[PDB]
């Protein structure tokens, strides 16, 4: 398993504009288009992102290209952030995937806000960090996905996904 397969399981693949769990306009593999309520504003961002007139629809290829860019940007964002990079560097390969997953879903800023959990991960206090991470809006809003990520940090294995 790798970061790509993991995120593909968590986000799904949709070739037509759709609303995410938060009600925002998204397409592909979790690519947020706009937090704006206008489908019009969404179709516009979409065309800008792909470089063509899509009319709300894209191909598999286009979806995967966006996905490649988002994963790359997620990684680069961690490495550029002081708070984040330090945790990232301290972690093993699988756990690194769990942090990238969080950053992809919630943005750098969002994850950087989990101060206490980050400190615990850095300290390798797996159980404690798992309990702390579950005390969040994140966990209450998307509990099945959050549990999968949390298990990944807890165990350092891909068990939560080998099911799926």
Swiss-Prot record:
Its EC number is 3.2.1.17. Changing residue 26 to E: Complete loss of activity at neutral pH; covalently bound substrate. Substrate binds at residues 32, 104, 117, 132. GO terms for biological process: cell wall macromolecule catabolic process; defense response to bacterium; peptidoglycan catabolic process; viral release from host cell by cytolysis. Keywords: Antimicrobial, Bacteriolytic enzyme, Cytolysis, Glycosidase, Host cell lysis by virus, Host cytoplasm, Hydrolase, Viral release from host cell. GO terms for cellular component: host cell cytoplasm. It catalyses: Hydrolysis of (1->4)-beta-linkages between N-acetylmuramic acid and N-acetyl-D-glucosamine residues in a peptidoglycan and between N-acetyl-D-glucosamine residues in chitodextrins. One of its GO terms (molecular function) is lysozyme activity. Optimum pH is 7.3. Transmembrane segments: none annotated. InterPro entries: Endolysin_T4_type (IPR034690), Glyco_hydro_24 (IPR002196), Lysozyme-like_dom_sf (IPR023346), Lysozyme_dom_sf (IPR023347), Phage_lysozyme-like (IPR052619), T4-type_lysozyme (IPR001165). Coiled coil: none annotated. Induction: Expressed late in the viral replication. It comes from the Viruses. SUPFAM superfamilies: Lysozyme-like. The active site is at residues 11, 20. Changing residue 11 to N: Loss of 84% of enzymatic activity. The keyword Thylakoid does not apply. It is found in: Host cytoplasm. Belongs to the glycosyl hydrolase 24 family. Endolysin with lysozyme activity that degrades host peptidoglycans and participates with the holin and spanin proteins in the sequential events which lead to the programmed host cell lysis releasing the mature viral particles. Once the holin has permeabilized the host cell membrane, the endolysin can reach the periplasm and break down the peptidoglycan layer. HAMAP family: ENDOLYSIN_T4 (MF_04110). This is Endolysin. It comes from Enterobacteria phage T4 (Bacteriophage T4). The gene is E.
């Amino acid at each position: 398993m790798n970061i790509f397969e993991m995120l593909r399981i968590d986000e799904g693949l949709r070739l037509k504009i759709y609303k995410d769990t938060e009600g925002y306009y998204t397409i592909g593999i979790g690519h947020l288009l706009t937090k704006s309520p206008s489908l019009n504003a969404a179709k516009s961002e979409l065309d800008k992102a792909i470089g063509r007139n899509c009319n709300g629809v894209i191909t598999k290829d286009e979806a995967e290209k966006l996905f490649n860019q988002d994963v790359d940007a997620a990684v680069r964002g961690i490495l550029r952030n002081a708070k984040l990079k330090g945790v990232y560097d301290s972690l093993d390969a699988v756990r690194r995937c769990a942090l990238i997953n969080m950053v992809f879903q919630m943005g750098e800023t969002g994850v950087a806000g989990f101060t206490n959990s980050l400190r615990m991960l850095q300290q390798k206090r797996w159980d404690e960090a798992a309990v702390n991470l579950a005390k969040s809006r994140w966990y209450n809003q998307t509990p099945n996905r959050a549990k999968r990520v949390i298990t990944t940090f807890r165990t350092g294995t891909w068990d939560a996904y080998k099911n799926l």
